[PDB]
Amino acid sequence: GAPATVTEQGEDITSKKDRGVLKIVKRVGNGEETPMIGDKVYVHYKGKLSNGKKFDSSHDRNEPFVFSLGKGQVIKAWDIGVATMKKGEICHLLCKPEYAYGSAGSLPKIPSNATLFFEIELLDFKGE
Ligand SMILES: COc1ccc(CC[C@@H](NC(=O)[C@@H]2CCCCN2C(=O)[C@H](c2cc(OC)c(OC)c(OC)c2)C2CCCCC2)c2cccc(OCC(=O)O)c2)cc1OC
């Protein structure tokens, strides 16, 4: 499935090159620009625990998914990953626990040492 493709073909976009965040572009976006730290970003996404039993999607939201990039409003994997995206791009992102919830987890929703998988579409981004 999609996660297996990311493991075997994904790009390691981590600074440490530890394979903690692996990416595949599924749909190429527009232009060349990718967001800067402090930019407000607008996304649609869906996500899951790698090993089963919990699934999330922005399509269930009343309002669009918005956050300021690089400001620790989301897990590390997203601050790293969404920063690499172009407007319109859709990517798959596989996120090891060190870039997500760690050994602590976020119980009872997210267990200890969970790997997460996301499909992310960057709708737009704007300056601060
Ligand atoms: C800097 O570190 C952190 C910053 C934020 C958090 C909180 C969870 C933080 N979650 C996340 O960063 C990641 C990436 C962005 C989408 C949501 N997300 C999640 O892990 C997903 C998530 C979705 C959640 O609600 C939609 C959620 O809130 C209950 C949540 O809490 C742990 C986690 C999970 C759900 C189960 C399947 C796997 C994905 C969060 C949730 C909801 C919104 C949000 O930002 C936008 C906003 O507030 O409107 C930030 C944890 C953090 O570290 C543990």
PDB file of C-alpha atoms and ligand atoms in Angstrom:
ATOM      1  CA  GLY A   1       0.000   0.000   0.000  1.00  0.00           C
ATOM      2  CA  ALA A   2       0.875   3.650   0.108  1.00  0.00           C
ATOM      3  CA  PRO A   3       3.078   3.358   3.273  1.00  0.00           C
ATOM      4  CA  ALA A   4       5.126   0.589   1.726  1.00  0.00           C
ATOM      5  CA  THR A   5       5.783   2.692  -1.310  1.00  0.00           C
ATOM      6  CA  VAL A   6       7.047   5.517   0.909  1.00  0.00           C
ATOM      7  CA  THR A   7       9.371   3.181   2.798  1.00  0.00           C
ATOM      8  CA  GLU A   8      10.975   1.778  -0.406  1.00  0.00           C
ATOM      9  CA  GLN A   9      10.933   4.911  -2.606  1.00  0.00           C
ATOM     10  CA  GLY A  10      10.450   7.852  -0.268  1.00  0.00           C
ATOM     11  CA  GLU A  11      12.866  10.722   0.096  1.00  0.00           C
ATOM     12  CA  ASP A  12      14.384  11.326   3.582  1.00  0.00           C
ATOM     13  CA  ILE A  13      13.738  15.018   4.169  1.00  0.00           C
ATOM     14  CA  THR A  14      15.186  15.062   7.700  1.00  0.00           C
ATOM     15  CA  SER A  15      18.192  17.194   8.597  1.00  0.00           C
ATOM     16  CA  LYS A  16      19.846  14.246  10.390  1.00  0.00           C
ATOM     17  CA  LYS A  17      19.144  11.837   7.503  1.00  0.00           C
ATOM     18  CA  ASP A  18      17.624   9.347   9.979  1.00  0.00           C
ATOM     19  CA  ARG A  19      14.657   8.362   7.790  1.00  0.00           C
ATOM     20  CA  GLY A  20      12.394   9.851  10.462  1.00  0.00           C
ATOM     21  CA  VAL A  21      10.294  11.674   7.802  1.00  0.00           C
ATOM     22  CA  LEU A  22       9.939  10.051   4.398  1.00  0.00           C
ATOM     23  CA  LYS A  23       8.055  11.727   1.528  1.00  0.00           C
ATOM     24  CA  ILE A  24       6.619  10.880  -1.870  1.00  0.00           C
ATOM     25  CA  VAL A  25       4.988  13.499  -4.117  1.00  0.00           C
ATOM     26  CA  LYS A  26       1.656  12.115  -5.423  1.00  0.00           C
ATOM     27  CA  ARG A  27       0.589  15.202  -7.278  1.00  0.00           C
ATOM     28  CA  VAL A  28       2.983  17.962  -8.380  1.00  0.00           C
ATOM     29  CA  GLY A  29       1.942  21.452  -7.275  1.00  0.00           C
ATOM     30  CA  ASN A  30       2.215  24.807  -8.923  1.00  0.00           C
ATOM     31  CA  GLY A  31       5.164  27.107  -9.429  1.00  0.00           C
ATOM     32  CA  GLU A  32       8.291  26.810  -7.358  1.00  0.00           C
ATOM     33  CA  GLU A  33       7.681  28.470  -4.087  1.00  0.00           C
ATOM     34  CA  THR A  34       7.511  26.494  -0.768  1.00  0.00           C
ATOM     35  CA  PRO A  35       6.508  28.105   2.537  1.00  0.00           C
ATOM     36  CA  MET A  36       8.807  29.860   4.962  1.00  0.00           C
ATOM     37  CA  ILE A  37       8.807  29.655   8.690  1.00  0.00           C
ATOM     38  CA  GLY A  38       6.022  31.879   9.933  1.00  0.00           C
ATOM     39  CA  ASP A  39       3.868  31.491   6.864  1.00  0.00           C
ATOM     40  CA  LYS A  40       0.224  30.547   7.480  1.00  0.00           C
ATOM     41  CA  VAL A  41      -0.525  27.334   5.692  1.00  0.00           C
ATOM     42  CA  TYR A  42      -3.869  25.848   4.662  1.00  0.00           C
ATOM     43  CA  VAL A  43      -4.099  22.115   4.092  1.00  0.00           C
ATOM     44  CA  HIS A  44      -6.449  19.197   3.576  1.00  0.00           C
ATOM     45  CA  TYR A  45      -5.164  15.868   4.939  1.00  0.00           C
ATOM     46  CA  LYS A  46      -5.890  12.417   6.118  1.00  0.00           C
ATOM     47  CA  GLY A  47      -3.811  10.397   8.485  1.00  0.00           C
ATOM     48  CA  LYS A  48      -3.531   7.089  10.246  1.00  0.00           C
ATOM     49  CA  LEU A  49      -1.563   5.024  12.638  1.00  0.00           C
ATOM     50  CA  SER A  50       0.662   2.770  10.624  1.00  0.00           C
ATOM     51  CA  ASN A  51      -0.269  -0.329  12.452  1.00  0.00           C
ATOM     52  CA  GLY A  52      -3.982  -0.177  12.383  1.00  0.00           C
ATOM     53  CA  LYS A  53      -6.708   1.326  14.175  1.00  0.00           C
ATOM     54  CA  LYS A  54      -7.136   5.021  14.078  1.00  0.00           C
ATOM     55  CA  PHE A  55      -7.879   7.338  11.147  1.00  0.00           C
ATOM     56  CA  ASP A  56      -8.345  11.090  10.828  1.00  0.00           C
ATOM     57  CA  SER A  57      -9.341  13.406   7.945  1.00  0.00           C
ATOM     58  CA  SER A  58      -9.769  17.197   7.609  1.00  0.00           C
ATOM     59  CA  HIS A  59     -12.825  16.515   5.470  1.00  0.00           C
ATOM     60  CA  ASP A  60     -14.687  15.993   8.728  1.00  0.00           C
ATOM     61  CA  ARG A  61     -13.878  19.574   9.872  1.00  0.00           C
ATOM     62  CA  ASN A  62     -16.309  22.500   9.902  1.00  0.00           C
ATOM     63  CA  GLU A  63     -13.491  24.908   8.884  1.00  0.00           C
ATOM     64  CA  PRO A  64     -10.253  24.562   6.803  1.00  0.00           C
ATOM     65  CA  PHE A  65      -6.836  23.053   8.570  1.00  0.00           C
ATOM     66  CA  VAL A  66      -4.637  26.074   9.209  1.00  0.00           C
ATOM     67  CA  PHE A  67      -1.418  26.596  11.070  1.00  0.00           C
ATOM     68  CA  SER A  68       1.694  28.762  11.139  1.00  0.00           C
ATOM     69  CA  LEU A  69       4.610  26.865   9.767  1.00  0.00           C
ATOM     70  CA  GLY A  70       7.685  26.250  11.784  1.00  0.00           C
ATOM     71  CA  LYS A  71       6.140  27.478  14.984  1.00  0.00           C
ATOM     72  CA  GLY A  72       5.493  24.148  16.734  1.00  0.00           C
ATOM     73  CA  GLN A  73       1.750  24.205  16.173  1.00  0.00           C
ATOM     74  CA  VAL A  74       1.942  20.669  14.769  1.00  0.00           C
ATOM     75  CA  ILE A  75       4.214  17.717  15.165  1.00  0.00           C
ATOM     76  CA  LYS A  76       7.828  18.027  13.949  1.00  0.00           C
ATOM     77  CA  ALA A  77       7.230  15.812  10.942  1.00  0.00           C
ATOM     78  CA  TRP A  78       4.707  18.359   9.594  1.00  0.00           C
ATOM     79  CA  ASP A  79       6.862  21.405  10.215  1.00  0.00           C
ATOM     80  CA  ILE A  80       9.550  19.585   8.184  1.00  0.00           C
ATOM     81  CA  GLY A  81       7.265  18.056   5.595  1.00  0.00           C
ATOM     82  CA  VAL A  82       4.804  20.823   4.739  1.00  0.00           C
ATOM     83  CA  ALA A  83       7.752  23.173   4.329  1.00  0.00           C
ATOM     84  CA  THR A  84       8.855  21.153   1.353  1.00  0.00           C
ATOM     85  CA  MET A  85       5.527  21.410  -0.493  1.00  0.00           C
ATOM     86  CA  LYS A  86       4.387  23.590  -3.365  1.00  0.00           C
ATOM     87  CA  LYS A  87       0.916  25.111  -3.659  1.00  0.00           C
ATOM     88  CA  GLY A  88      -1.384  22.378  -4.996  1.00  0.00           C
ATOM     89  CA  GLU A  89       0.969  19.577  -4.185  1.00  0.00           C
ATOM     90  CA  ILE A  90      -0.254  16.347  -2.573  1.00  0.00           C
ATOM     91  CA  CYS A  91       2.293  14.176  -0.791  1.00  0.00           C
ATOM     92  CA  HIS A  92       2.509  11.031   1.324  1.00  0.00           C
ATOM     93  CA  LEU A  93       4.500  11.384   4.530  1.00  0.00           C
ATOM     94  CA  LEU A  94       5.670   8.508   6.818  1.00  0.00           C
ATOM     95  CA  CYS A  95       6.619   9.805  10.245  1.00  0.00           C
ATOM     96  CA  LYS A  96       8.651   7.914  12.851  1.00  0.00           C
ATOM     97  CA  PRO A  97       7.870   8.483  16.528  1.00  0.00           C
ATOM     98  CA  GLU A  98      10.838  10.837  17.168  1.00  0.00           C
ATOM     99  CA  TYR A  99       9.113  13.289  14.755  1.00  0.00           C
ATOM    100  CA  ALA A 100       5.606  12.670  16.134  1.00  0.00           C
ATOM    101  CA  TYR A 101       4.622  11.636  19.690  1.00  0.00           C
ATOM    102  CA  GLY A 102       7.690   9.747  20.799  1.00  0.00           C
ATOM    103  CA  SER A 103       7.823   7.142  23.501  1.00  0.00           C
ATOM    104  CA  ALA A 104       5.179   9.089  25.440  1.00  0.00           C
ATOM    105  CA  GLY A 105       2.586   8.823  22.837  1.00  0.00           C
ATOM    106  CA  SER A 106      -0.667  10.765  23.258  1.00  0.00           C
ATOM    107  CA  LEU A 107      -2.734   8.202  25.108  1.00  0.00           C
ATOM    108  CA  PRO A 108      -5.149   6.662  24.575  1.00  0.00           C
ATOM    109  CA  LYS A 109      -5.481   7.813  20.902  1.00  0.00           C
ATOM    110  CA  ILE A 110      -1.767   7.522  19.938  1.00  0.00           C
ATOM    111  CA  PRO A 111       0.348   4.703  21.494  1.00  0.00           C
ATOM    112  CA  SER A 112       3.964   4.831  22.506  1.00  0.00           C
ATOM    113  CA  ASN A 113       6.427   4.712  19.639  1.00  0.00           C
ATOM    114  CA  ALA A 114       3.827   5.016  16.927  1.00  0.00           C
ATOM    115  CA  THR A 115       4.714   5.579  13.269  1.00  0.00           C
ATOM    116  CA  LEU A 116       2.120   7.779  11.471  1.00  0.00           C
ATOM    117  CA  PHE A 117       1.165   8.054   7.805  1.00  0.00           C
ATOM    118  CA  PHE A 118      -0.355  11.129   6.206  1.00  0.00           C
ATOM    119  CA  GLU A 119      -1.679  12.221   2.819  1.00  0.00           C
ATOM    120  CA  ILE A 120      -1.392  16.027   2.733  1.00  0.00           C
ATOM    121  CA  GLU A 121      -2.586  18.567   0.142  1.00  0.00           C
ATOM    122  CA  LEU A 122      -1.174  22.097   0.438  1.00  0.00           C
ATOM    123  CA  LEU A 123      -4.036  24.418  -0.513  1.00  0.00           C
ATOM    124  CA  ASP A 124      -2.365  27.759  -0.035  1.00  0.00           C
ATOM    125  CA  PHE A 125       0.085  29.671   2.109  1.00  0.00           C
ATOM    126  CA  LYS A 126       0.384  33.301   3.043  1.00  0.00           C
ATOM    127  CA  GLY A 127       2.967  35.506   4.784  1.00  0.00           C
ATOM    128  CA  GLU A 128       2.855  36.650   8.460  1.00  0.00           C
TER     129      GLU A 128
HETATM  130  C1  LIG B   1       4.911  20.832  18.717  1.00  0.00           C
HETATM  131  O1  LIG B   1       4.331  19.598  19.095  1.00  0.00           O
HETATM  132  C2  LIG B   1       2.974  19.415  19.070  1.00  0.00           C
HETATM  133  C3  LIG B   1       2.046  20.387  18.589  1.00  0.00           C
HETATM  134  C4  LIG B   1       0.710  20.109  18.610  1.00  0.00           C
HETATM  135  C5  LIG B   1       0.156  18.912  19.124  1.00  0.00           C
HETATM  136  C6  LIG B   1      -1.239  18.625  19.121  1.00  0.00           C
HETATM  137  C7  LIG B   1      -1.666  17.539  18.072  1.00  0.00           C
HETATM  138  C8  LIG B   1      -1.534  18.110  16.688  1.00  0.00           C
HETATM  139  N1  LIG B   1      -1.503  16.996  15.672  1.00  0.00           N
HETATM  140  C9  LIG B   1      -0.590  17.040  14.687  1.00  0.00           C
HETATM  141  O2  LIG B   1       0.320  17.813  14.608  1.00  0.00           O
HETATM  142  C10 LIG B   1      -0.738  15.937  13.596  1.00  0.00           C
HETATM  143  C11 LIG B   1      -0.410  16.606  12.237  1.00  0.00           C
HETATM  144  C12 LIG B   1      -1.474  17.586  11.788  1.00  0.00           C
HETATM  145  C13 LIG B   1      -2.828  16.844  11.751  1.00  0.00           C
HETATM  146  C14 LIG B   1      -3.185  16.161  13.031  1.00  0.00           C
HETATM  147  N2  LIG B   1      -2.059  15.318  13.549  1.00  0.00           N
HETATM  148  C15 LIG B   1      -2.235  14.080  14.152  1.00  0.00           C
HETATM  149  O3  LIG B   1      -1.266  13.539  14.653  1.00  0.00           O
HETATM  150  C16 LIG B   1      -3.638  13.515  14.208  1.00  0.00           C
HETATM  151  C17 LIG B   1      -4.394  14.217  15.351  1.00  0.00           C
HETATM  152  C18 LIG B   1      -5.587  14.857  15.046  1.00  0.00           C
HETATM  153  C19 LIG B   1      -6.246  15.505  16.093  1.00  0.00           C
HETATM  154  O4  LIG B   1      -7.438  16.204  15.839  1.00  0.00           O
HETATM  155  C20 LIG B   1      -7.869  16.479  14.482  1.00  0.00           C
HETATM  156  C21 LIG B   1      -5.774  15.462  17.359  1.00  0.00           C
HETATM  157  O5  LIG B   1      -6.484  16.213  18.354  1.00  0.00           O
HETATM  158  C22 LIG B   1      -7.302  15.376  19.131  1.00  0.00           C
HETATM  159  C23 LIG B   1      -4.616  14.844  17.678  1.00  0.00           C
HETATM  160  O6  LIG B   1      -4.212  14.852  18.950  1.00  0.00           O
HETATM  161  C24 LIG B   1      -3.064  14.089  19.312  1.00  0.00           C
HETATM  162  C25 LIG B   1      -3.896  14.171  16.659  1.00  0.00           C
HETATM  163  C26 LIG B   1      -3.592  11.975  14.345  1.00  0.00           C
HETATM  164  C27 LIG B   1      -4.927  11.391  14.682  1.00  0.00           C
HETATM  165  C28 LIG B   1      -4.968   9.850  14.735  1.00  0.00           C
HETATM  166  C29 LIG B   1      -4.334   9.250  13.431  1.00  0.00           C
HETATM  167  C30 LIG B   1      -2.970   9.784  13.175  1.00  0.00           C
HETATM  168  C31 LIG B   1      -2.995  11.332  13.124  1.00  0.00           C
HETATM  169  C32 LIG B   1      -2.637  18.997  16.294  1.00  0.00           C
HETATM  170  C33 LIG B   1      -3.918  18.534  16.207  1.00  0.00           C
HETATM  171  C34 LIG B   1      -4.990  19.249  15.708  1.00  0.00           C
HETATM  172  C35 LIG B   1      -4.675  20.521  15.221  1.00  0.00           C
HETATM  173  C36 LIG B   1      -3.403  21.037  15.243  1.00  0.00           C
HETATM  174  O7  LIG B   1      -3.013  22.274  14.724  1.00  0.00           O
HETATM  175  C37 LIG B   1      -4.008  23.095  14.108  1.00  0.00           C
HETATM  176  C38 LIG B   1      -4.977  23.685  15.142  1.00  0.00           C
HETATM  177  O8  LIG B   1      -4.676  23.662  16.337  1.00  0.00           O
HETATM  178  O9  LIG B   1      -6.024  24.072  14.640  1.00  0.00           O
HETATM  179  C39 LIG B   1      -2.336  20.230  15.769  1.00  0.00           C
HETATM  180  C40 LIG B   1       1.067  17.946  19.583  1.00  0.00           C
HETATM  181  C41 LIG B   1       2.428  18.261  19.519  1.00  0.00           C
HETATM  182  O10 LIG B   1       3.489  17.389  19.831  1.00  0.00           O
HETATM  183  C42 LIG B   1       3.090  16.199  20.489  1.00  0.00           C
END
